[PDB]
Symmetry: C3
Subunit: 286 residues, 3 copies
């Protein structure tokens, strides 16, 4: 196997974007199904459908893939992904993570990734936000890693480290910003496990993930993190706990998409404000 994208392709996509927008972002944000609403908060907002952009992964009905939205968020030059790609849709990971390298070539230097996730930590609650300290890349252990294939030193090295993936600084500064909001629920912190889905975990699977020391489980994010780190982007991110994964057999309740979307709605505002304010803690470039 090999990544279908040459270095030229990534360059080409970047230059097309450079040519079609006056904006020069520093921060890339990937909005997890939870918070697509964040694009309202940008100013001088400029939108591209993924479908117009050269080399972008395609959805069968082109618009459902989503949009790149350049603008200013709280004084930071941002580019946001509204709509993202998952491996459970059929995308190889070198497609799932193609935007990330586009971003880097655009001059972006930081990545913010957000997502919804099911709560593995018994103490978490629906509505909680959990900062990401670390991850467990289960698909990666098997071979499903976005870097699989020949390495291009122009992006990064053959064997990058992931022990430092999630910026220590941004994580402290984020605990700050949370006192500033004066919230009843404390800001949570922990390990995100990626699994591929798309079906939901069984009781026995949940117990396995708990025992790996994971706190939250989703089906995205980790690959984008690995590619970001590979090419030198600073990374921060968090999860919205939309549900507490079913952990025993007597319970009559089931994990479902409607209630994940619903939970997304409650924490909607909360999340925007949160990310928006965090913007200011991001070091300026140079």
């Amino acid at each position: 196997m090999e990544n279908g994208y040459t270095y030229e392709d990534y360059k080409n996509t970047a230059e097309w974007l450079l040519s079609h927008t006056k904006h020069r972002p520093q921060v890339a944000i990937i909005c997890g199904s939870g918070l697509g609403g964040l694009t309202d908060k940008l100013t001088q907002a400029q939108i591209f459908d993924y479908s117009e952009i050269p080399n972008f992964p395609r959805s069968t009905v082109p618009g459902h893939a989503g949009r790149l939205v350049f603008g200013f968020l709280n004084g930071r030059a941002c580019v946001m992904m509204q709509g993202r790609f998952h491996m459970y849709e059929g995308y190889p990971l070198w497609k799932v993570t193609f935007p990330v390298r586009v971003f880097h070539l655009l001059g972006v230097d930081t990545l913010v990734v957000t997502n919804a996730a099911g709560g593995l930590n018994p103490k978490f609650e629906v509505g909680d936000i959990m900062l990401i300290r670390d991850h467990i890349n289960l698909p990666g252990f098997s071979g499903q890693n976005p870097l699989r294939g020949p390495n291009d030193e122009r992006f990064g090295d053959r064997f990058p480290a992931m022990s430092d993936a999630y910026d220590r600084t941004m994580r402290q500064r984020a605990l700050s910003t949370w006192k500033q909001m004066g919230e009843q629920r404390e800001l949570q912190e922990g390990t995100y496990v990626m699994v591929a889905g798309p079906s939901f975990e069984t009781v026995a699977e949940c117990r396995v993930l708990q025992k790996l020391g994971a706190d939250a489980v989703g089906m995205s994010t980790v690959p984008e993190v690995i590619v970001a780190r590979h090419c030198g982007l600073r990374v921060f991110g968090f999860s919205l706990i939309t549900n507490k994964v079913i952990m025993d057999y007597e319970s009559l309740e089931k994990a479902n998409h409607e209630e994940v979307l619903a939970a997304g709605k409650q924490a909607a505002q909360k999340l925007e404000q949160f990310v928006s304010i965090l913007m200011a803690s991001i070091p300026l470039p140079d």
Copy 2:
């Protein structure tokens, strides 16, 4: 990647079967290498070689794939798979699980899956039957899930739940039926872990599976379960413990296929009677 089968293909296969048999099954049974003998017990039995059926996964020597056998088992209209597909033979999972959706389109509403498995629970014995309460889909965590790819709502939703995979009712009713048989060994119950094989586990691998809370290990079943559940079939199943997986280094004994086939032979009759009787506990349709 994408499933090679369109909705039309599944429909087409179903209609061909509808057209070539007067039978209308309610129950689909997948006989695990253990109990192929069960086809003797059907009445008004009608056989199709997989090789004659449109869109069916093919074996290189066509007959070795096996047969669909429609008939009546203890007053229930059944269709049985004699021969099944494993991922270790090279099949993608959308082929492994193609029959299951054919069955649903045939009007089947329940699935019975049986298999042979190695015993992880230290208290299990060769000959034991273990009802399946839950599973751990290791291949699924990595991306190997039969639903990977675009979802067709005509079958089921994007993110189906698996916490309720194994019918609670059928599992109690099955403990009933077992007293009825008056057996010396008790009916076992537990978690089936799927691994892909085809080579057998090492000592260290076994210990890993034990610590995930698995009771039995095989190389099938879970994908068919996931697809069944996805399209609304009630699911029940069990494993025949053919061997106790080697768990320490001093032992001179090895897991082998001959002794798995042999164990299949002992529990042969026992299993037939068992499944045959269980038939009566399956709710009628409507």
Copy 3:
């Protein structure tokens, strides 16, 4: 999916080698990035670039793949792989492990595999050698197994056992040879876990591997072991601990390739002597 190599292809490669060298090896050695230097120690040494050999996996720049080197090591007729294939480079496992079956058809009957690995056991130190007692094939659990696909009985059976993978005899005889060297560090022994990489493990991933009972982690070897065992080769091997995997969050240190290559250099001589002497403990054929 299927293995791209027919039986004829393996035969063809073997006969080409049989025809181009007067040597008839008994022992195949796979030198892990650590000890490529071992080829200096052979006598009557004869080299083939992988690129000249029919059906050999290719590197894009052909020479970077490496060389087969036939010769005599301490009175044993050896063939050595200098350069090996990993799945993180993009190779399917039936390519990664193609040489192993070539070796068997060459009349080889033993395999020695060496590699570098990160230390999971808290008591291990950089420089330590760890004999391989067992392995945990994480990629194998998901479907990534070199035997996936139709089986050819000419090599081995459908479901070979791996509980006896690592020769008990060779492992005792190897503890012998180590007293003989009179070393300050004791000879270590334990379980090698394979993961696919190519990025390095996170803290949380490390803790997961520790809790599976692994002692060392690398990105090779296991597939070659599985294929060797499948066709009847005796197998022995070991790892050079080049680094201690980062296990807590306060540490400022990172796993990197430079320091893995560096560690390779320290244990260079040590390893050669070691393997060279071990040669004598290998039973003669017949």
